[PDB]
Ligand binder design. Structure first.
Ligand code: GLU
Ligand code: GLU
Ligand code: GLU
Ligand code: MN
Ligand code: MN
Ligand code: MN
Ligand code: MN
Ligand code: MN
Ligand code: MN
Lengths: 445, 445, 445
């Protein structure tokens, strides 16, 4: 409540308040107010900003006082407050603001009465490098990745000495220190995440050489979890930075080793009960099977939001199979063997950290409801259709399979059109710029 | 009062008093007295200095005891006192001293009875670089800008490692840390500004890559705000310096990305009421519309003072349109959608941080009054005339549209002539020195 | 004649024929045919090329067989043939092709009966440097000039030893070797020019340090002389190159020392007699005085063609005075003291080597005829109006004083409009790119 934020301000000698919001692409934006400008008026009628120079968008920042967290990194005491972008005076909420779209998808779920709450559990992976250099110019282009754990540094002269314990290319999965250099960086990330209100469940090194890592975090309701992904990413980016590292959530930074995916565990609940539990395949309800059928029916349109970068598809090369299974980890829909009670859920394996968590989760939910809503029966478990094979395909697919997103006003046409417009500009730059392996393949033609 | 300054001296064990004043170009000058020379005589009959070697000007420094601030940076305890330049013995105030000219424009407003007070709200932007090298010689010339946030450093080898989070060319507008490197430098700038008597409203990164920033600051009456711009600039220059950065207020340091403008919000008030509020276009009074009409009528003469550098016009290339609007941000006069009560005001978007805040504000006020004073009706909102396209144009225009500035003795002819003389010398050096892209364009002729 | 070219081909074992033409900007273009494609058909119906990618313009190259010269530089025996650009099939001559425009201005002179021939004598100056580096990018810009003769190298360590005889900044005018490093390079330029059909009169070092030079060459009729300037420039550029130097015709490469101008000596003749000789001021006819009056009347429009680069105006800073005189070398129209018979002529001092010699000469002639044609009496000799002070001014002036150029179809409106369009693009790049002395002037604002 406003009341509560106002005590924290004194209770913490807060010098500044950081207004934060997420844009269409997914990047957390922010503007800073002195604490002495937080008073009634503020939580009442928000603060005006020029929304015009935000990519894909005067507007009003409306502070959500439930979100107040103290920033673990800025030097002066700062209280972060997440905001919604509202349409000014009229005060309804930009239909292009991803947090508003997430909130709408949650209310539409309630209005359909299929369940009261959506529970999301994203598993975001990241890379933690020491040096990343890249560039493109008329005379050429390059990218150079470097990290102490890179299997390629086995030959490197280091002046401290080389020391040689390092994860080989698919060998980052699990060896104790010193092969895993990041135990203290991940534990620190866990402690700062909890200080910001997240609940860590586990942290470990991932499969790739050169710093792949994962901090596993307890689930939440869709829009709250989407904000927790924005804090997750902020803590990973800044703790890495304090440690002299650079972290990245891009899906596929290295060819020849693992990519970073963000698998979404989903579940639905009506009056304190898990609608996905039941009889049917592996403890699932018929309700749950239609949710899977809706996700599979709309997978390529979902890919435009859950895999929104041209790089995403370097990862999604032959979890490409649109199929559910408790057995086949090759099927993009895994039914986790919970064994346990009514933690029954589905896991969609194909999205990646580059996805805007609000739009990505809203689209998975809207697809899953359209399955239920039309008895779209999934089929049989593989123990056969595939995800979009490229961003251009995914964008065409979103453009044509636009209907399930527009249900109940969650996502307008202007919103979907402006989104495809942004992603197309990106796709073009990648399409028109010659790639280094083309010189390898075609220079002596 | 003198009395008050004299207590602060003991109350702070002040070792020195720094006498400060602004020259015609806008640069804050200063001379330092030991605290033990501040006594009755001082606040009474000022201190003599050789005014002769100040560009464009024995004279007397008259301490304004209302302005006493402790300097947050000098090692020994120092009390800053702003001064006015007075004509010696006779004690009236140099008609070429920009602070005196500002004070005269405020009294002339009172003498016309159109309002009691002018309220100015400048929005100055700046750049925060790490390295700036430049030079011109017979055999050539160069400038080299560098900053950690420069999109161009994506390819750079750094020996710490490169870390790669950086604002792209028009992408400095708003991303959270680590992409925005300056959160602590701007918050610190905010805290030192307030310690010097300013009220910060907000601080944020601006649109440009390579360190564009903005600290938004609460309005004031014209001459007081013009001094607050001189403190604003002093704090930005010295906090940046403590941080190992170099700040600059020049309008256009980089081609191909945003420039730093200083938009002036203006409003007029008679007996505690906002004369700019009313009926008419977007909450405006007819009074306000004539103010806009005077600004537009005299825009090119105002440009010689509000855009006084040849570099200013590298920014003002196709807010060039002399038009008012609540809608068109392309119109140089924006009527801000206050929505709120009688914070109704106009915003002139075209001036830049290089402007002498006293002369720039005095000229906007004198132009705006001549509009009121002659019912110079602005026209209709673009939702078509332009600003001077060059300093030479702006200087010719000031020279011919000299009358509205001379009203009530605000600005003499000698004052306007000496000003154009200074700005012409500058224009010539830029006009006669061959430019690097000319070799690109014409060497193989 | 075709017949003649065809013998030279055998007479010289010519392996290739180089088709050359000049574009709107003045740069000589070329395409190469094997000698075995020169036959009747060729001199008859020309050769087709894509005129579309020439700046400011399928078309036909029509070989002018009078122009055949052997190329003194290509390794394989090549015969250069100058061409006219004709409108295809219809075969009339592009009204935007500068050589055609020159030929039209000569025929219009004949059709007016004022004289049979125009005689032009351009005095082009050039610079001969060793190293020229420059560039402009978002993070900055630079130009670096270097030559062994640069007064600035007096301090330079050279590893051969420094040897120290060098022209000081305005001291390149006339000292014997070793101070003048270019005696053999200029004599060689003279011998190759004559081998290409030009008649050298004198060669000498010019006023500037760092390699300013001049090869003086015997006059000709307008279009023939305009082609001789294109050969002049080609020989200077390639002999310099063989010598390890780089030559440039740009008007003002160095601030603080002389610029390279191309003064045009002009004269008119009817039935073997010099119309410019007579009684009146300094041996001049009344006919000649009206020619001067037309040049002065149209000077700023002529500047858009005779001084077509933004750099041109770095040279034309306070021969700026539009005045004739036998005495005042400050007057842009000098009446040379011939003393001798009826070599009486006028000299216009203001054009520079960057000018397209066809369009520059055609415009001086058309202006001079409009003087005669309307008795535009010049005035009295200075022993007061000036040339355009910038390319933008010159381009506005050409755009408005368009009439005298359109006389008799010499220059169409499309031709004049496309020309201003090209020169404007150039002016803009120079106007929008920040200049290095602006950082010197305004960084600490
Ligand atoms: N990192 C894998 C996911 C690994 C896993 O299944 O644990 C991906 O690219 O999605
Ligand atoms: N920086 C812009 C102003 C940006 C804005 O309108 O917020 C300028 O050059 O004036
Ligand atoms: N080089 C001079 C001309 C020198 C001369 O008159 O001989 C110019 O800039 O035009
Ligand atoms: Mn994982
Ligand atoms: Mn999983
Ligand atoms: Mn701004
Ligand atoms: Mn503004
Ligand atoms: Mn000469
Ligand atoms: Mn001469």
């Amino acid at each position: 409540s406003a009341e509560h934020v106002l005590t924290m301000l004194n209770e913490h000698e807060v010098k500044f308040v950081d207004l934060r919001f997420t844009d269409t692409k997914g990047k957390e934006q922010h503007v800073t107010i002195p604490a002495h400008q937080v008073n009634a008026e503020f939580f009442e009628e928000g603060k005006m900003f020029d929304g015009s120079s935000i990519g894909g968008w005067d507007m009003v920042l409306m502070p959500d006082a439930s979100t107040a967290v103290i920033d673990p990194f800025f030097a002066d005491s700062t209280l972060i407050i997440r905001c919604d972008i509202l349409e000014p005076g009229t005060l309804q909420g930009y239909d292009r603001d991803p947090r508003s779209i997430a909130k709408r998808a949650e209310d539409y779920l309630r209005a359909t009465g299929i369940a009261d709450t959506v529970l999301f559990g994203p598993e975001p992976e990241f890379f933690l490098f020491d040096d990343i250099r890249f560039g493109a110019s008329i005379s050429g282009s390059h990218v150079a990745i470097d990290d102490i754990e890179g299997a390629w540094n086995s030959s490197t002269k280091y002046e401290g000495g080389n020391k040689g314990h390092r994860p080989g290319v698919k060998g980052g999965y699990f060896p104790v220190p010193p092969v895993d250099s990041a135990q203290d960086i991940r534990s620190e990330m866990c402690l700062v995440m909890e200080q910001m209100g997240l609940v860590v469940e586990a942290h470990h090194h991932e499969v790739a050489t050169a710093g792949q890592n994962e901090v596993a975090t307890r689930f939440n309701t869709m829009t709250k979890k989407a904000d927790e992904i924005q804090i997750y990413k902020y803590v990973v980016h800044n703790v890495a930075h304090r440690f002299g590292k650079t972290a990245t959530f891009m899906p596929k930074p290295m060819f020849g080793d693992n990519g970073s995916g963000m698998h979404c565990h989903m579940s639905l609940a009506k009056n304190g009960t898990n609608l996905f539990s039941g009889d049917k395949y592996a403890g699932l309800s018929e309700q749950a099977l239609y949710y899977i059928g809706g996700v599979i029916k709309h997978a390529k349109a979902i890919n435009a939001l859950a895999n929104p970068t041209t790089n995403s598809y370097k990862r999604l090369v032959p979890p490409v199979m649109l199929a559910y299974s408790a057995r086949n980890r090759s099927a993009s829909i895994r039914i986790p063997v919970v064994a346990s009670p009514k933690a029954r859920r589905i896991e969609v394996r194909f999205p990646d950290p580059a996805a805007n968590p609000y739009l990505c989760f809203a689209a998975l939910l809207m697809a899953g409801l359209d399955g239920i809503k039309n008895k779209i029966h999934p089929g049989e478990p593989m123990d056969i259709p595939q995800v979009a094979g490229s961003l251009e395909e995914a964008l065409n697919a979103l453009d044509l399979d636009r209907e399930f997103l527009k249900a109940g006003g969650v996502f307008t046409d202007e919103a979907i059109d402006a989104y495809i417009a942004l992603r197309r500009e990106e796709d073009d730059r990648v399409r028109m710029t010659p790639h280094p392996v083309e010189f390898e393949l075609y220079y002596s033609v």
